[PDB]
Amino acid sequence: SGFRKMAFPSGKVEGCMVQVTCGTTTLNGLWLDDVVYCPRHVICTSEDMLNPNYEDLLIRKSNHNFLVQAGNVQLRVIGHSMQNCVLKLKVDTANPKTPKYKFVRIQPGQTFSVLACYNGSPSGVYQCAMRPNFTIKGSFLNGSCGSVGFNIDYDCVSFCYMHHMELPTGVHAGTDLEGNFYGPFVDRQTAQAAGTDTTITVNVLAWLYAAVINGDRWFLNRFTTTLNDFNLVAMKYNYEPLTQDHVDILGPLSAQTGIAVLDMCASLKELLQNGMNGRTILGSALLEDEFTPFDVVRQCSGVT
Amino acid sequence: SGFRKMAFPSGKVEGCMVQVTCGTTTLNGLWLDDVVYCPRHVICTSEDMLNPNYEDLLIRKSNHNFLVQAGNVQLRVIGHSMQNCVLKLKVDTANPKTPKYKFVRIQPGQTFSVLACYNGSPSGVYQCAMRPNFTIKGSFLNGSCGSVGFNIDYDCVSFCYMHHMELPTGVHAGTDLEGNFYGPFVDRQTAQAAGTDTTITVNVLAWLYAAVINGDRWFLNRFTTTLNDFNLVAMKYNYEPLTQDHVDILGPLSAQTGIAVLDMCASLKELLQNGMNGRTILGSALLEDEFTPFDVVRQCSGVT
Numbered sequence: 001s002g003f004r005k006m007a008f009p010s011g012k013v014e015g016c017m018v019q020v021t022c023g024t025t026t027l028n029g030l031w032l033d034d035v036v037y038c039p040r041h042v043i044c045t046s047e048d049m050l051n052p053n054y055e056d057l058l059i060r061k062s063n064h065n066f067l068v069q070a071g072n073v074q075l076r077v078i079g080h081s082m083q084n085c086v087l088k089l090k091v092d093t094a095n096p097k098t099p100k101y102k103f104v105r106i107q108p109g110q111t112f113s114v115l116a117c118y119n120g121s122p123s124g125v126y127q128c129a130m131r132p133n134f135t136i137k138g139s140f141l142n143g144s145c146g147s148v149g150f151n152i153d154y155d156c157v158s159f160c161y162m163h164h165m166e167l168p169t170g171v172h173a174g175t176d177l178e179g180n181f182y183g184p185f186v187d188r189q190t191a192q193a194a195g196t197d198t199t200i201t202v203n204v205l206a207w208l209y210a211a212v213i214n215g216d217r218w219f220l221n222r223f224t225t226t227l228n229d230f231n232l233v234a235m236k237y238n239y240e241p242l243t244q245d246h247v248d249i250l251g252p253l254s255a256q257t258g259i260a261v262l263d264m265c266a267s268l269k270e271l272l273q274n275g276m277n278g279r280t281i282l283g284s285a286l287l288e289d290e291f292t293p294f295d296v297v298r299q300c301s302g303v304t
Numbered sequence: 305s306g307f308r309k310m311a312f313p314s315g316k317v318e319g320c321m322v323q324v325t326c327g328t329t330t331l332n333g334l335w336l337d338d339v340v341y342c343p344r345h346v347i348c349t350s351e352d353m354l355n356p357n358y359e360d361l362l363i364r365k366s367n368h369n370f371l372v373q374a375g376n377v378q379l380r381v382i383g384h385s386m387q388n389c390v391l392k393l394k395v396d397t398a399n400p401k402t403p404k405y406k407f408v409r410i411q412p413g414q415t416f417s418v419l420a421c422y423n424g425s426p427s428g429v430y431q432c433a434m435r436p437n438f439t440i441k442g443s444f445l446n447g448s449c450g451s452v453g454f455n456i457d458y459d460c461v462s463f464c465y466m467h468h469m470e471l472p473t474g475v476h477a478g479t480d481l482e483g484n485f486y487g488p489f490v491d492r493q494t495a496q497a498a499g500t501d502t503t504i505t506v507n508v509l510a511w512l513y514a515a516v517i518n519g520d521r522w523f524l525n526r527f528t529t530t531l532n533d534f535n536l537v538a539m540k541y542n543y544e545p546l547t548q549d550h551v552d553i554l555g556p557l558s559a560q561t562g563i564a565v566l567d568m569c570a571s572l573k574e575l576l577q578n579g580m581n582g583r584t585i586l587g588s589a590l591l592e593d594e595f596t597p598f599d600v601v602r603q604c605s606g607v608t
């Protein structure tokens with residue numbers, strides 16, 4: 001028992017991290033096969049960030065202007081191209097530590113681990129979720145750009161995020177491994193405000209099932225609700241609308257605990273309306289929404 | 305910016321995990337050099353756990369009764385010994401992935417990362433702290449025994465914990481890499497209740513400094529306190545007494561933010577007395593105590 005904000009083991013992704021330097025800018029790159037992926041703003045000065053024409057800035061850069069360093073040895077860049085907001089630097093050596101991998105674009109509500117890096121060196125690993133406003137609440141400093149978000153399916157690493165930017169409000173923006181930003185953000189130092197950060201209802205429900213599985217049962221009540229009834233309360237609390245797909249997704253957790261999905265919805269409805277009353281659930285004084293129903297099943301069953 | 309419960313990169317420790325089987329019991333082992341460390345209860349049946357005489361049970365076991373499997377290849381056990389509550393299985397091959405390492409016994413309040421494993425395979429990584437009652441609030445299931453807790457100092461892994469047991473209240477108990485349990489726990493299936501789980505005051509103060517560093521400043525007040533005055537309030541809230549050593553430890557965070565340690569103590573004193581009033585600090589509705597002052601500095605400066 002016990003339920004923790006758990007990240008995937010990072011070793012497979014640590015073996016992919018490299019340092020990319022272009023001129024006076026140094027960020028992280030992801031080395032898979034003979035390609036190094038990094039944010040295209042590696043080609044900018046802090047002044048170019050204000051209004052960058054990336055296609056024009058890139059005309060002035062050649063293969064030798066990109067200094068790629070894996071560990072403490074230099075990689076030879078034999079080609080470079082821009083795919084959306086990422087640069088792909090073709091090197092002459094295939095990464096020997098390249099794991100089985102995929103590039104996936106995730107939906108809001110989905111969770112992933114992040115291996116925060118500085119100068120191609122991993123500093124830490126943590127779990128976060130793609131918010132409904134397409135930002136992430138990470139922990140990134142200057143030099144952390146190029147750090148990646150991922151999920152592991154036994155031996156296959158599914159890369160879903162590359163860190164690019166920090167909005168004025170401290171939240172984070174980035175792209176998938178094809179260079180397409182999550183949400184409306186652009187790689188420009190311009191005022192970009194995120195939209196409403198709603199709560200991922202399906203994830204809160206999954207976390208309430210993890211609490212019942214791990215012995216926290218105080219919040220369980222004698223009521224039930226309907227999808228329409230629960231969604232009226234959820235809207236009022238800036239919770240995402242719950243769909244029949246989310247109910248289906250919760251099916252296995254509902255089977256494991258014997259608590260019907262709509263009964264758990266009524267438990268959540270009362271927690272929203274009454275508050276925690278100074279109580280905690282899985283060591284938390286707030287309703288956690290960064291555990292998907294798949295994460296709950298994986299952690300509670302011990303998938304390796 | 306952004307402040308997350310961050311674990312150390314786990315790759316160095318993933319390369320040490322092996323599966324240890326003795327009879328019908330299978331748990332995890334830590335392979336460093338030509339030695340495999342694992343909990344001594346690998347030699348017990350679920351019935352032996354009730355009242356085990358380990359020295360007697362071990363008489364019946366030979367080198368060939370310990371099946372050590374690294375990845376999918378078997379290791380040859382050429383010796384075995386019991387050190388306190390751990391078994392050291394000498395193998396004929398030195399682990400090629402053995403990192404630079406140390407065995408350290410940590411004090412309560414200290415934090416470390418845990419790489420949870422099942423059948424020698426890493427399933428996840430998370431951060432936790434040695435509680436003042438010498439338990440940890442981990443996430444471990446049946447088969448997770450032998451999973452280790454560690455800290456990294458650049459390239460040196462300091463192993464501080466091996467998981468052994470789950471108390472009836474869901475909390476966790478284990479030993480250091482010398483086999484000595486943290487606290488009073490014994491490797492017996494007997495009623496063992498943990499003592500008071502007090503809050504690690506120095507860690508809460510360090511986390512309040514991380515909040516000010518990352519822009520959460522609402523809780524800052526116009527008051528100051530003394531060590532004696534703050535400790536009267538802290539005792540009443542089951543907070544650990546704050547010492548001049550803890551004040552000295554906070555010195556650098558105090559310098560970075562310009563907020564005197566005793567001023568932050570008064571901020572904490574008011575949060576304890578008034579509550580959060582439905583507000584959050586670093587995305588938390590409760591005062592987090594599993595970040596040491598060293599963790600705050602490391603994460604906020606990006607030590608790799």
Ligand SMILES: Cn1cnc2cncc(NC(=O)[C@@H]3CCOc4ccc(Cl)cc43)c21
Pocket residue numbers: 041049140141142143144145164165166167186187188189190305
């Ligand atoms: C500067 N900085 C501090 N903590 C950060 C965490 N993550 C990222 C950054 N970096 C940025 O956001 C830079 C700074 C200049 O403005 C822009 C504009 C667009 C883009 Cl794509 C990147 C950036 C951080």
Ligand SMILES: Cn1cnc2cncc(NC(=O)[C@@H]3CCOc4ccc(Cl)cc43)c21
Pocket residue numbers: 001345353444445446447448449468469470471490491492493494
């Ligand atoms: C059974 N189990 C379930 N979730 C666990 C998480 N961590 C550990 C265990 N295992 C144990 O605690 C076993 C079960 C039998 O009782 C004892 C007694 C002493 C010792 Cl050292 C180990 C154990 C877990």
Ligand SMILES: [Cl-]
Pocket residue numbers: 166167168188189190191192
């Ligand atoms: Cl910006």
Ligand SMILES: [Cl-]
Pocket residue numbers: 470471472492493494495496
């Ligand atoms: Cl027990």
